[PDB]
Each structure stands twice: as structure tokens, then as C-alpha cells.
Homo-oligomer: 126 residues x 2
């Protein structure tokens, strides 16, 4: 039942490549932040946010008729939903890989929470 | 080290979340398996964006340009993915072959895409 070790492989490739390419194509968008953010991210969260940026950006392009606010309004819950689900899937794989230690569970959780809040902040940028 | 398995759990969350969000937001263009599809949809998005960063260039002009960057991109990705899989002592003959499988396939499929449309 170890399609689980297939999933992990593919994820590693996905994440590394999306990085490498995004960098090489100079798509590397400067991380968008609240000028007075009290929060400090790490590279993991930063990767994640840059990811969500692209998704939003393309969502925007795909909805020309829609206003800027409506666009943020609509995209916000899908992004939250996507991330919480993403997380749930990432956890399942790890439980299944029998590597879901209390340490790793806590680190991954912290990362979700960090990312959610950072995105909440990003969405406030008018 | 804890360091590596972090980079792992992060990669999981990244991949999955990008998967989820792209589906939920209906970002799409209307043979393969999910892992390649995922990667493809990955690259198509990036290219699509890269397109928009050069409104002035022609369509072939951007395919010409983006292709090598996608190729170089995957290879690097693949190396880095082998790194962690080794660091974690979890790089089975089976796993390695599976991964190399996914590299080549994706790789080809993207080439077939460039010839199309």
C-alpha cells in the first residue's frame, strides 16, 4: 500500500522544480509583505507564499471582468481551503510513511499556522 | 538531521497545497498519471506567467526561450529530490527507479506539449 513512497518522491520533485524554474525564469516575485509585519517567516513559509502569489496572480488574469476587491474576496477562501486540505494530505502521507513523529507533526503544524497568518496579512494589502 | 525531514514535510505541504488550490480556483487548460499531470500543470502555469512577463515576444519566441529553463529546472529538481531521499536513508532501488521514471515521462510530455498549440 506504499503509493505513499511514490507520493513523497513526486512532492520533492514538484517542490524543488517549481523553485528552480520559478527562479530561472525570473518569475521569482519579491515577497509581498505588510510594511509593519510583526511576523518573521522562514524559507519554507516564503516558498509557500510565493506559491500562493502565482496562483492568485493567474486567478486574476483569468477573471478580467472582475474588480480587484472581488478578486481578493473570491480567492481568499479558496486559498485557505486549499492550504488546510494540502496540509491534511501532507499529514496523511507522513502517518502512512510512519515518519509522523511528534517533532515533525509540530513543525509542520507551526508552518501551516505561520503561512495562514502571513497570507491573511498579504490579503490586507490595498 | 531534523533539517532534512523538515525540508521534506515542507515539500509535501507545498506540493499538495499547490495541487489543491489550483483545482479549487479552476486554473486550467480544458497519456500520463497524476504525478506527471501535477508537474505539467506546474510548468504550464509558470510558462503562462513568463509569457505575461514578455507581452512583446511572439509565441514561438517564448517556447524557444522557456523550454531549456524548464529542462534545466526539472533536472536540478530531480537532483535535489535525490539528495533528500538519500539524506533520509529512504532511497530504495524501487524509489529511485520510480523517481527517474517520473522525471523522464514529465520531461517527454512537456516536449510534446511545446509542439502542440
Amino acid at each position: 500500500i506504499s503509493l505513499s513512497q511514490g507520493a513523497q518522491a513526486a512532492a520533492l520533485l514538484f517542490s524543488a522544480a517549481m523553485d528552480q524554474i520559478s527562479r530561472l525564469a525570473e518569475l521569482d516575485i519579491e515577497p509581498v509583505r505588510l510594511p509593519e509585519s510583526e511576523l518573521t517567516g522562514d524559507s519554507h513559509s516564503q516558498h509557500l507564499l510565493l506559491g500562493m502569489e502565482i496562483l492568485m496572480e493567474l486567478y486574476r488574469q483569468q477573471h478580467p471582468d472582475w474588480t480587484a476587491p472581488a478578486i481578493r474576496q473570491a480567492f481568499a477562501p479558496l486559498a485557505r481551503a486549499g492550504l488546510e486540505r494540502g496540509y491534511q494530505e501532507a499529514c496523511q502521507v507522513l502517518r502512512q510513511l510512519n515518519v509522523y513523529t511528534p517533532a515533525v507533526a509540530g513543525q509542520l503544524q507551526g508552518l501551516l499556522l505561520l503561512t495562514q497568518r502571513l497570507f491573511e496579512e498579504r490579503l490586507q494589502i490595498a
